[model samples]
Target: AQNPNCNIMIFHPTKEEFNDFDKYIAYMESQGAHRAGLAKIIPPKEWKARETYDNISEILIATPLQQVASGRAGVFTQYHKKKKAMTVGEYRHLANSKKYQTPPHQNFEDLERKYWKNRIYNSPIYGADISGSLFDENTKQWNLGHLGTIQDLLEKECGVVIEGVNTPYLYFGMWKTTFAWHTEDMDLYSINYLHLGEPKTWYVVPPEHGQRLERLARELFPGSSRGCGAFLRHKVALISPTVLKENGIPFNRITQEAGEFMVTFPYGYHAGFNHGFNCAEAINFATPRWIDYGKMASQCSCGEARVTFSMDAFVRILQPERYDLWKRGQD
Candidate 1:
């Protein structure tokens, strides 16, 4: 039989691999974080959803009254480590509260019909609680591999430029919660692990088509990423799959279920939606292969020479090492 379609990436690694970073990294690299798809690790489920708030934070009242979105009581709490942390039940109550639903421009029917998709919040657990940034023992817990990731090697040797943005963010999503189409700041590789929640549906266009999409975005939106008004709006247009297809850019959809990890390849343009309430942890890093993308992503009109990490630093150190290795081979 023929091999599988390269895009439908799904893996089931050996049990021991979880204890070995190289083995785990091999699994991740085999597919390359470029194509967006599902990679299920040994962990089989999201306790938040499976046990329903009685897991992880693992403690929430799952009684009948709170189960239905509309039946609850509090107002929407934008969760952040600094968010003063509401009880999940209170958070849910507010999430479905009518007071929180009606916007001056939008009434209940319009937003509700769409399951309040517009009331989305893209928060990091702190947007800053990156594992690598943790100077203490906590670093070991969040670092990517048992053996180590490409980012791990660079940092160990004192190249800490990439460590600053090596953060794992948290997401609290509800029905139809839309995560707009965008690549990681400056083409970084990001691995999003669903800590616990419903499936998040994704639309991805490979790196080969990333530039094409960006041009299309420029023409369609026309503006600066600064005070010029890139994000000063309630909502922006979500480019449809059909539109991309017509433009000859390849894109695909994946309903990333809970307990599954989604790898957004460097420079891959992707967007997603939450089917319902869910929480996830996402982090950014780089591999040797990401140097070119990292540099390009952070250096033009929309590019800000410095983004999540210092791409120039990687390229700077890398350029010399590459020459030295090549020269050595001549001998």
Candidate 2:
């Protein structure tokens, strides 16, 4: 149903673990994971990290056609190749527009203000077409959809029931620039699907450290308006797996056939960067939920305002199970 308030869940199984995907599904079903709609296992070969800034710079120049530009503003197929450049003004204007506007707010300015003031920095990022639904139709444009074998496993073997709304979709693409680190919406979890890329390094600070990082980012990148108090604040370096070993930051290095690695962030601070020749993606799923449009009924405005739709209302109409998921989460 294209519900934006949905949560994101990622599963990255080791080679041994994924070899028995059927058993994993059985385990989830036994543990009451039936509320989930989809299940995806990303190919381990696709997971990778960025090794260096120069490597990232090279990709920026070389892979103009591979990048995806998306936000609340509008969905442009290949923005970098078409425009060749993007300005802060253009980004802000597009991000603020109604078509790309996020739920619970009508404008980007209000969204930003609410994010900073309320310490709820849950907006999606600017680069890449990370949205999962885009691939459901265009499978060939990018290797974004689930392989048929995996989908069959979920439908036939997993007796708990499977639906696209609750299943994870894997992504394989490149990012030309750095994306600001922030918490995900609905406290969803995600893991990197590294493929054909230099190792991307990450430094994670606790949520308590968010204030310090916000201050540093504000001072270092003035007028950037990228980081807010609630956003993640950590350093990212692209290095060899060996380099990551020396630093010792709860690290895991997975090779092509090693299967995918898992990193679950339930309101944690994490970020990544592309080092060079980097092509990576992730497998993510979310349990669908309803949004209460009645909460905003008091905001007396028309045209766009009157057009407001809510998942809470829609779920009640199309999918009652989604409404049940919302109710269960609240409990």
Candidate 3:
């Protein structure tokens, strides 16, 4: 008999190990844990988890209406140019609405077709900034800002806030609500925590296989890919694992339950959907290792994917001030 194959690494850490994130992450990355592109962390059993929406605000509603593309599998693709904004409470009610419930004996696509036919509202509360409004002090500890790996170097080292990438963004999900295949802004590392709710299913293709994933994506959606080499960054294409398997693209399936953390490595592609109604918070961060990938992504670009941040500027910030020392030597 052969041992089970685990594509995504899973870590079980004590409170002390989990809390000291910098040390633990370095240890994990050194041990080749990040080679898989995605890793899941299980905090000690004694850890307490809470919901943090004491301060609710307007969130972008992502409409994932399924559509058949060129005789291909029906995909739940999203177009963000024209966004519908709604309050957290309103989105919650809309998600739990009776019409949106999955029907018996019907497949997910069937239900999606039902939604399309009836013009039912199927949306996920996404990109909601909650850096200012945490539920309480207890919840603040888990905030992305306090987390070591995701601490914005630009803000802490350079005193500039990039808003979405630096501050935490809250996500509300229900059945069939999908975050399409994409990497973080500038290919930075992203840490996502499931505060409380149903599990999320994440599909990841390691950075090593990132080009394979890109090739398949382009083959699948030539129109979009031809228009933009980084079309996946658009967060509109939802390719199933079946397609990936058929194309021989190596990938992993990860289930992120409540109270667990899922870390996405730099340049690794990840796409997933919520199991049910769940709330999660996520933010992006950069370590010394991500600079190379960031620079490459910025350099290889088309009109669709604009340079979100100045990579050369970031590299300069990380560089030491040698000009002053050179001047002293000259004197």
Candidate 4:
């Protein structure tokens, strides 16, 4: 596979290699592991940074499973209300309510059809959140709540320095759906793990083609109009190395552990489908940052054009200096 824009490197020392601690340190030094400004993707085996800002917060624990599912439904319902052009605060309140809760169901398709799909909030932001809603309520609450707590406890118990911006909403979850490809809005990144299955076909077309595909897909699937006005004209792509056979494809045999795939945001486009019964998981998180010009402009135009706002414009509009500390990842 080609080297990704970013990668994860694992370092394991042999018994003999560590016989001389100083020598081992020298060996690590030779590997460019000590380079200035380098950041470790994975935390050390032991926790070592309890009091630091990077320490995971506690508010992320799962809101009872029912509550989570309800939260997703609420979000979708409110999203629909917004599609009808409700105010942001109005949508937020409705989505945060309990009345829109989804009951136990095999999948989110029914709920999506009922609360989303042709309904309002069918835009890109709603589209992305719909995907998030399915994953969050159906699977993420359990995994994120458990793993997140463990990550926090580990930090409090040990002192390992897991460097990153600390936000109250740090979380991870898995999403499996039989849907076509699409890109997310600005400001999100995730680590994908292909567990249980792979799609029949996957491709990461260039930015130009990616945008074209998105436009075509939107036309073909009008429900995707919500996402139409956010991304640049040629900002998204499908990156599949090979296509799978249509018949007799194996899905259950595939699996991926946590932290296997590192996905970066600001500009990442991925859309594919599970040929048959599919399963996969991923960890999702976001670093808090004010909306950039690209996003603000996209929102302003309601995603009509793909032109992005300049960084200077974003800074001027959002007052970057006020959040300088947060921008530095110190918050």
Q: Best candidate per lDDT, number? A: 3
Candidates ranked by TM-score, best first?
A: 3, 1, 2, 4
The residue-by-residue lDDT of candidate 4 on 1-331, one tens digit each, is: 2212222133454434424433533454355432211112222333121223222222122221111111222121121112343332343233334533223345434433343222222222121221221122323212322233212322444443343321212222112121223333332333343222222122222222334444543443344355444333323222222221122111111222332222323333444323222223444333322123124322313333232222223323344343343233211
lDDT of 2 by residue, 174-270 (tens): 2123333443333334444444433333333333243443454354444332432222222211122233334432322222211233333333334
TM-score of candidate 3 relative to the true fold: 0.74
Prediction RMSDs, each to the true structure = 10.8, 15.9, 7.9, 14.6
Which candidate do you rate higher for TM-score, 1 or 3?
Answer: 3
- Candidate 3's residue-wise lDDT over 246-322, tens digit each? 78988887678888889998888898776566778787777667766665552223434443334334433433353
* Number of residue pairs clashing in candidate 1, backbone atoms closer than 3 angstroms, sequence gap of 3 or more or interchain: 10
Residue 105: error of model 4 in Å?
A: 20
Per-residue error for 295 in candidate 1, Å, reads 2.5
Off by over 4 Å in 3: 1-6, 49-71, 74-76, 81-85, 102-135, 138-142, 148-165, 298-331
- Against the reference, the lDDT scores of all candidates come to 0.48, 0.33, 0.63, 0.29
Clashes of each: 10, 23, 0, 22
The candidate that achieves the highest TM-score relative to the unseen native structure: 3
Clashing residue pairs, backbone N/CA/C < 3 A, model 1: 21-146, 21-147, 33-265, 34-265, 54-58, 55-58, 74-94, 75-94, 125-170, 130-167
TM-score of candidate 1 against the unseen true structure: 0.60
